[PDB]
Amino acid sequence: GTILIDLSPDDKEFQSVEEEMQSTVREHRDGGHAGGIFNRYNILKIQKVCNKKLWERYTHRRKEVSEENHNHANERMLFHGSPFVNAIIHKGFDERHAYIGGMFGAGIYFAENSSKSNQYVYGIGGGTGCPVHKDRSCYICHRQLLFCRVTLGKSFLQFSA
């Protein structure tokens, strides 16, 4: 039941999403090993992901969290990179999208920095890079990221390297 609706580059919604993408690029401590060397993106397309069932499943849980946290969902918009973005948009997030070896336990990871999520588009550590060229810094191949609505509720603060 997922449909993808293309946003026009002239739409304010396209423009605010592109700006969040571009402005949250940073340098990474791997010198670009996992995600490639770049300071900015060429945005090719932004699509709205519309799935009534998955939306209702999200808002249902959002309300449960909210009611457990003084009517505060603590909702953010965050990036997610994954080889399984195509499954996510059709079936939603679940346990199979979890990063088992992540630094904060087995769960589903999101980033404020778009360039951090970019490191995971081809797998953990960038895997072996693009399917076509086996290049983690491929400048030709089209990559996909998700920009997601995420309910944090009461979040456990872990200070970390």
Partner: protein, 47 residues
């Protein structure tokens, strides 16, 4: 997946070394995220 720490719905990974890094977040229930936008892009080679 693991569970959230007791009494919490997520974890926030606060950067405590790299001064420029933004936060990262973990949820333990897939129902706590909705994939709103699919962004297709290329990384650009620096000039």
């Amino acid at each position: 997946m693991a569970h959230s720490p007791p009494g919490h719905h997520s974890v926030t990974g606060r950067p405590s070394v790299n001064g420029l890094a933004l936060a990262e977040y973990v949820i333990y229930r897939g129902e706590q995220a909705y994939p709103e936008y699919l962004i297709t892009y290329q990384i650009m080679r620096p000039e």
